[PDB]
Amino acid sequence: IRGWIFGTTLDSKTQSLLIVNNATNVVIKVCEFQFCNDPFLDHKNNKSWMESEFRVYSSANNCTFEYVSQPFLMDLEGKQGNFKNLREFVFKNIDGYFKIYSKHTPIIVREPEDLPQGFSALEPLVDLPIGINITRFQTLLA
Amino acid sequence: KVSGNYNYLYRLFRKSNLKPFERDISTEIYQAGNKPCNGVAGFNCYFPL
Ligand SMILES: *[C@@H]1O[C@H](CO)[C@@H](O)[C@H](O)[C@H]1NC(C)=O
Ligand SMILES: *[C@@H]1O[C@H](CO)[C@@H](O)[C@H](O)[C@H]1NC(C)=O
Ligand SMILES: *[C@@H]1O[C@H](CO)[C@@H](O)[C@H](O)[C@H]1NC(C)=O
Known part of the structure; x- marks a missing residue:
């Protein structure tokens, strides 16, 4: 998973x-996009x-926002089975402010998987x- | 400007209100009545801004 797209008509x-x-x-762009x-x-x-x-977008007309910051934790190469990483975020926009809360946890040894149990709190990012x-969103497999 | 400057524009017709600190740059014909407006400058279909 590389990122997300949020919008209403796209x-x-x-x-x-576009995150x-x-x-x-990281690259976050707020712009008018002709999404494929x-x-x-x-x-x-x-x-x-x-x-x-x-360029998943055919063209990029007048944009409004540009932002580059420190990326997130990365997993190198492709491995199948015994997935040891869980990444959970929450996305919410209120009062014109987009808030993303992020949390990362290692060493998930649950073979059956299905969203783990227990308890963990999320920090502001x-x-x-x-x-x-904002009305609809997708996920950017890439 | 002495002759008149048109660089500053305001939106006049819109279906719904604006939530706080929210920006809208869309420019599409706004339907005053029940009649479809496929994009026209005629009856009951007017430019928003
Ligand atoms: C992201 O980084 C890669 C590697 O530096 C580069 O090939 C790609 O064009 C970049 N994409 C964007 C949208 O910045
Ligand atoms: C993956 O693509 C790169 C170039 O995009 C190529 O050099 C490499 O051989 C490809 N790997 C496989 C397994 O096809
Ligand atoms: C955002 O877009 C949706 C879909 O067009 C619309 O229903 C909603 O009223 C919009 N929000 C506004 C205008 O504040």
Whole structure:
């Protein structure tokens, strides 16, 4: 999972979000986007993941916000089975402020999986003065 | 400007209100009545701003 897209129409008619992790940083863009039908950065070979198709948007017209900061924890290579990482976020916009709360936990040894039990609290991460409307979101497999 | 400057614009017709500290840059024809407006400058279909 690379990031998320937030919006209401996603057809260059209304402004929209784009959050995605790359390189050793993060990029968050608020802009009018002409999003393609299928949103991915997967495809260039058979199996070794490639960051191909960097511009999932056909074009980028007048934007409003730009932001680059310290990225999140990264998992190298592709491993199947015994998934030791859990990452949980909450996303909410109120009063024109976008709040993202993030939490990371290691050493998940639950083979059956199905969203783990117990208890954990989430810390504030960042607040963005975006000031737009938001109705629907997706996830950016890439 | 002495002749008149039109760089400053205001939105006049809109379906609903604005939540606090929220920006709207959309520019689409606003339907005054029950009649469809597929994009026209005619009856009951007016520019928003
Ligand atoms: C993200 O970083 C990678 C590696 O530096 C680069 O190839 C890619 O173009 C970047 N994408 C964006 C949207 O910054
Ligand atoms: C993955 O793609 C890269 C170039 O994008 C290529 O060099 C590499 O051989 C590919 N790996 C596989 C397993 O196809
Ligand atoms: C945001 O967009 C939705 C879908 O068009 C709309 O129902 C809602 O009223 C909008 N929010 C506003 C105008 O504050």
